[PDB]
Amino acid sequence: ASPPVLDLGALGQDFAADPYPTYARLRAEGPAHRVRTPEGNEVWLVVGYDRARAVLADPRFSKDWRNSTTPLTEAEAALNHNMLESDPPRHTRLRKLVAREFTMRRVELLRPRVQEIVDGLVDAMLAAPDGRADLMESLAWPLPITVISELLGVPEPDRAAFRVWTDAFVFPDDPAQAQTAMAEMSGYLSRLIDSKRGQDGEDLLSALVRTSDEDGSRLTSEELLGMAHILLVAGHETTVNLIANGMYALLSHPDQLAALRADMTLLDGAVEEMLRYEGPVESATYRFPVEPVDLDGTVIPAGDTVLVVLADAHRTPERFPDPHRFDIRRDTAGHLAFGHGIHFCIGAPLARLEARIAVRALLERCPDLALDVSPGELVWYPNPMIRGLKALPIRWR
């Protein structure tokens, strides 16, 4: 098994909008399958819950490009010295540098500010005299970029460029465009990092700049750039699309929206079912077997690129009964939306804070909130890694 069984690019927007039957037909055949992604990368998909969960945490599957037979491009090579693209001991050292910033209790201190951002965004949206807006434009995009920029020290005029870059690397026009985006962002971050030195800033990037300048063995200039990149990007498309994907799931399932409105203590469980049913990470980041790995008789060679397909894990009926049902009351324990094992999402407390506030705000403030679009007018991103919409037209009384 070297040739792909499927080119997901060829499957078009049908597969972007509703990839589940594809993954499930694969799962019926076996746990691992060669495919060519839309962007043109030949990779393995790992499907099925138990196998997904095990591969995510299995140290046989490195995240370090030194273990990949595909080389990094020059633009990619400027950015790979980050925790998500490292194994221990580098992963361990890098994540210790920021772990305290992202604990549930540290992130709790942002609640007043996150609440204020949401309320301001929601007030402005609610001023449309026709009671129609795009939820993606009004709320889901600007909330997470505001929060993460304040933390990191990205000046407000520089924030809109990240929507552009981050879209380019999710859904590029062509392979060139993703590579150009990366180089542009990378250049920008290097300049931003530079502009911090000697400036006595108190944001997280300023603190990391001093840490690296005081001792480059603790945080190298390449690691300094990779940390800035990963904290910005890793949390970005994900949080934005959690908010919009989840509100889409709630609004397209009126019984569940009604349940939640009648019992707002259902809120945490609802956001967990958003993650399970409509989470933004469709497939996890690249893994590379350090030696050939046998998965029930399918052998993945050492060095090949492996996607763990979280979306299909989440539709495995042995683990999530009646898996196509969006049920805010469901037991979502064991979902893989934030990963599992040493790379488990460091942003999860922050992501949950943002999405819980946002969902509750929309619900309490937008009476008769509803979709303003037939489900088939929506357009989805093709990338097998990220599940995401272009727009989300909504309406309220």
Ligand X SMILES: CC[C@H]1OC(=O)[C@H](C)[C@@H](OC(=O)CCN(C)C)[C@@H](C)C[C@@H](C)C(=O)/C=C/[C@H]1C
Residue type, 111: R
Question: Per CB under 6 A, does 385 bind ligand X?
Answer: yes
Residue choice 48, 279, 323, 388 for contact with ligand HEM (CB under 6 A): 279
Q: Which two tokens stand for residue 365?
A: 């403030």
Question: Per CB under 6 A, does 142 bind ligand HEM?
Answer: no
237 touches which of ligand X, ligand HEM, none (CB within 5 to 8 A by kind)?
Answer: ligand X
Question: Per CB under 6 A, does 237 bind ligand X?
Answer: yes
SS3 294: strand
Q: Which stretch binds ligand HEM (CB under 6 A): 72-80, 172-180, 198-206, 274-282?
A: 274-282
Residue whose pair of structure tokens reads 């999402």 in the numeric block: 345
Give the side-chain half-sphere CA count within 13 A for 78.
Answer: 17
Question: Per CB under 6 A, does 52 bind ligand HEM?
Answer: no
Taking CA atoms, 276 is separated from 110, 348, 391, in Å, by: 25, 14, 21
Residue choice 178, 346, 371, 385 for contact with ligand HEM (CB under 6 A): 346
SS3 152: helix
Binding mask 150-169 for ligand X (x = CB under 6 A): -------------------x
User: Nearer Cβ to ligand X, position 39 or 134?
Assistant: 39
Residue choice 47, 78, 79, 84 for contact with ligand HEM (CB under 6 A): 84
Residue choice 42, 58, 64, 76 for contact with ligand X (CB under 6 A): 76
Those residues with Cβ within 8 angstroms of residue 243's Cβ, 6 or more apart along the chain or in another chain: 139, 140, 143, 144, 354, 355, 358, 359
How far apart are the C-alpha atoms of 59 and 94, rounded to whole Å?
18
Question: Per CB under 6 A, does 362 bind ligand X?
Answer: no
Kindly state the smallest distance separating residue 231's Cβ from ligand HEM, in Å.
Answer: 5
Residue choice 234, 242, 257, 337 for contact with ligand X (CB under 6 A): 234
Q: Which residues contribute to the annotated binding site?
A: 85, 178-182, 229-237, 345
Taking CA atoms, 316 is separated from 14, 134, 276, in Å, by: 21, 33, 11
Question: Per CB under 6 A, does 284 bind ligand HEM?
Answer: yes
Interactions with ligand HEM, residue window 213-242 (CB under 6 A): 230-231, 234-235, 238-239, 242
User: Nearer Cβ to ligand HEM, position 148 or 270?
Assistant: 148
Residue whose pair of structure tokens reads 């910033």 in the numeric block: 101
Alpha helices in the chain (DSSP H): 8-17, 20-29, 49-57, 90-96, 104-108, 111-126, 135, 142-152, 160-170, 175-196, 204-214, 221-233, 236-251, 254-262, 267-278, 310-313, 348-365
Binding mask 315-354 for ligand X (x = CB under 6 A): ----------------------------------------
Kindly state the smallest distance separating residue 351's Cβ from ligand HEM, in Å.
Answer: 4
How far apart are the C-alpha atoms of 256 and 47, rounded to whole Å?
28
Residue 355 exposed, middle or buried by CB count within 10 Å (0-12, 13-18, 19+) = buried
Question: Per CB under 6 A, does 338 bind ligand HEM?
Answer: yes
Q: Interface with ligand X by CB under 6 A: which residues?
A: 72, 76, 79-80, 84-85, 169-170, 233-234, 237-238, 281, 285, 383, 385-386
